[PDB]
Amino acid sequence: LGSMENFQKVEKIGEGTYGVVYKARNKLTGEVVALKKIRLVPSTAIREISLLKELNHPNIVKLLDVIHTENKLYLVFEFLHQDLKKFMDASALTGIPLPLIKSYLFQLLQGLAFCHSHRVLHRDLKPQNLLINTEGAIKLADFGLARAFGVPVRTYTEEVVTLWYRAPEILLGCKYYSTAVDIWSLGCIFAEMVTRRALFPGDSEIDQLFRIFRTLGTPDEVVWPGVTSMPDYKPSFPKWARQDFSKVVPPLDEDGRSLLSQMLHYDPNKRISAKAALAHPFFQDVTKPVPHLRL
Ligand SMILES: CN1CCC(n2c(=O)c(C#N)cc3cnc(NC4CCN(S(C)(=O)=O)CC4)nc32)CC1
Numbered sequence: 001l002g003s004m005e006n007f008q009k010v011e012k013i014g015e016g017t018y019g020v021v022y023k024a025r026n027k028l029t030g031e032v033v034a035l036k037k038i039r040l041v042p043s044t045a046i047r048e049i050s051l052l053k054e055l056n057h058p059n060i061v062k063l064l065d066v067i068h069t070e071n072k073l074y075l076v077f078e079f080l081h082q083d084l085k086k087f088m089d090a091s092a093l094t095g096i097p098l099p100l101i102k103s104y105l106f107q108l109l110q111g112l113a114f115c116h117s118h119r120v121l122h123r124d125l126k127p128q129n130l131l132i133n134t135e136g137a138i139k140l141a142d143f144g145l146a147r148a149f150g151v152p153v154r155t156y157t158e159e160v161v162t163l164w165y166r167a168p169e170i171l172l173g174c175k176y177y178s179t180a181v182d183i184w185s186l187g188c189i190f191a192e193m194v195t196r197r198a199l200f201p202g203d204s205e206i207d208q209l210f211r212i213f214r215t216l217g218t219p220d221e222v223v224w225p226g227v228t229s230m231p232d233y234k235p236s237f238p239k240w241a242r243q244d245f246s247k248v249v250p251p252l253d254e255d256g257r258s259l260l261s262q263m264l265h266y267d268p269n270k271r272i273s274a275k276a277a278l279a280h281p282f283f284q285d286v287t288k289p290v291p292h293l294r295l
Pocket residue numbers: 013014015021034036061077078079080081082083084086087128129131141142143
């Protein structure tokens with residue numbers, strides 16, 4: 001008891017399947033933080049979270065402290081004022097300028113290269129989990145654990161975006177998926193920044209799969225060896241032919257289209273790694289612009 005009395009909740013800024021997130025102020029120190037409340041900790045989670053506390057990087061939202069009290073587990077995070085969804089909405093008539101898209105993509109590939117080099121997966125990359133500040137930085141937020149825990153929040157409202165960034169190996173039942181799942185998600189987000197429309201906006205697992213298939217072609221053993229033995233693969237899947245990326249993310253230039261196509265390879269072993277993507281010619285002229293944020 002009493003270990004949270006040091007935090008004044010200022011406003012609720014998120015509700016997940018398994019947690020709620022507040023903007024909060026430390027009453028002793030005055031720091032403004034994000035507090036995630038999880039209602040009850042498998043020791044396995046105790047150590048997954050402990051390793052995240054050591055996973056410190058300029059493009060990862062810092063986990064400041066973990067506090068266990070009552071029937072609750074509190075995670076204290078660095079606070080940022082806006083996420084990429086809100087910024088993309090505010091930017092929609094114009095679109096985010098390409099140099100800023102490129103900066104954000106580059107930074108997130110750096111953050112991913114870092115956490116992948118430590119065998120840590122995000123697992124749930126999406127615009128609302130990408131937080132931005134006034135200095136042009138963008139940071140990865142709310143890493144997903146390999147197994148959830150806690151009490152589902154009963155007031156949780158379904159979000160349309162939940163499946164839109166899921167890699168095809170996850171949708172097909174892969175149990176031991178790899179860092180490639182994050183590269184897929186980030187490529188979907190890259191496409192969305194460029195076009196101002198979600199790339200694959202499915203509302204069910206099969207709708208998501210079929211939206212991917214209708215654009216990239218139904219995968220087979222030619223392009224994805226082993227796909228036909230995946231747990232949820234069905235020979236009865238419709239066979240759609242691939243479309244050209246030129247139709248998928250116009251008016252993106254060939255350097256960007258090239259990189260995107262490698263981020264969206266079906267085969268997780270052919271999909272580009274974060275480290276390799278950082279060397280892609282798309283980033284030869286990368287800079288760090290500062291966005292105009294209305295806070
Ligand atoms: C949508 N959901 C809300 C919880 C969010 N979140 C975490 O999960 C988290 C962890 N761990 C740490 C966070 C730190 N800071 C902020 N700041 C918010 C960002 C968005 N904005 S906003 C709509 O653009 O105005 C308000 C300020 N959010 C965090 C992200 C996902």
